[PDB]
Amino acid sequence: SSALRDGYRQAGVSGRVRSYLDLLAGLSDFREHFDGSDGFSLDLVDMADGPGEVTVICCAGTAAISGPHEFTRLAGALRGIAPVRAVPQPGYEEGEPLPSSMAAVAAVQADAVIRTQGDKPFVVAGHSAGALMAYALATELLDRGHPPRGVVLIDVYPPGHQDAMNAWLEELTATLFDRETVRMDDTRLTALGAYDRLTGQWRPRETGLPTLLVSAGEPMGPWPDDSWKPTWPFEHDTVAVPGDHFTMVQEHADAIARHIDAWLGGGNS
Ligand SMILES: [Ca+2]
Ligand SMILES: [Ca+2]
Ligand SMILES: [Ca+2]
């Protein structure tokens, strides 16, 4: 383990996660950054192939365990349904710098999407804070004349509607350790802090893009009404799937794949 990883786990146990995330963001300021016009680039990962004209481009999350592997299950369920590629968030692996703004990351990822897709249509998807990153990427793409056909936001908690995420921060942190299939090293933990700060200060812009909100079917803890659910401030359609914030996209990834297929044309709209 490492001091940072042990500290994170103790932040969960002791109810001081917000404090610890603010520390990790502070520390991140001492790492190398990129600003979008210094020559940094990245590539997309090919995850599955499928029929049709529309690729599902999935953006990695911002958790310290996040990465293109978070979509292995979803991509397996979409194999033979639609092509699937994944966008990494830069700075979670060795040798990669961190973005100095949302605009920086969105620019390098949009470069990669355009280089890989050409004029082949696509939708952008992400989960949790990765859904904020996905929408920012979709926005960038639209502002460059390659809009996506739509955006899939999986269990998104936007700025100003994060009350359940805040109530559950300890539970979330303990669950991340129970589901640590990629080790939380110090590169990942400082990248967590950096992206948590970026996404917390950002605000989405209205785009008019078709949007599918995919919600967990149950809360990670007891709630008095339905105000614990993910939400989105702009026009969207909504579906729910089995599972909670974590299991919905892993154990129940097939349910997600089914709604994506219907939304891409496999229902009756
Ligand atoms: Ca510069
Ligand atoms: Ca490392
Ligand atoms: Ca289909």
CATH number of the domain bearing residue 251: 3.40.50.1820
Per DSSP (E only), the strands in the chain are 33-34, 45-48, 55-59, 84-87, 98-99, 122-127, 150-154, 211-216, 237-241
How was this entry determined? Answer: X-ray
Q: Among 193, 200, 205, 202, which Cα is nearest to 165's?
A: 200
What CA–CA distances, in Å, run from 249 to 41, 118, 186, 242, 243? 28, 28, 25, 9, 8
Q: CB neighbours (10 Å) of residue 35?
A: 15
Is 245 catalytic? The answer is: yes
- Say if residues 89 and 59 touch (Cβ distance below 8 Å): yes
CA 138 to chain centre: 12
Residue 143 tokens, joined? 């502002």
Q: Which residues are annotated as a binding site?
A: 62, 129, 155
- Say if residues 87 and 57 touch (Cβ distance below 8 Å): yes
CA 239, CA 262: separation in Å to the nearest integer? 11
Gyration radius of the chain over CA positions: 18
Q: Among 138, 156, 124, which Cα is nearest to 231's?
A: 156
Beta bridge partners of 202: none
CA 257, CA 82: separation in Å to the nearest integer? 10
Is 128 catalytic? The answer is: yes
138 CA to centre of ligand 1 in angstroms? 23
Provide the resolution (angstroms). 1.7
CA 137, CA 90: separation in Å to the nearest integer? 13
107 CA to centre of ligand 3 in angstroms? 31
Q: How many domains does the chain have?
A: 1
Residue 75 tokens, joined? 């991509």
CA 232, CA 211: separation in Å to the nearest integer? 9
Helix-helix angle 186-201:3-13, to 10 degrees: 50
CA 128, CA 59: separation in Å to the nearest integer? 11
Task: Compute φ and ψ for 240, nearest 5 degrees.
Answer: -120, 150
Q: Which residues are annotated as a binding site for substrate?
A: 62, 129, 155
Residue entry with tokens 């365990």: 65
Give the domain extent around 154.
Answer: 1-269
Sheet holding 55-59, edge to edge: 45-48, 84-87, 55-59, 122-127, 150-154, 211-216, 237-241
184 CA to centre of ligand 1 in angstroms? 29
Q: Catalytic one among 66, 215, 245, 259? A: 245
Residue 29 tokens, joined? 């300021």
233 CA to centre of ligand 1 in angstroms? 33
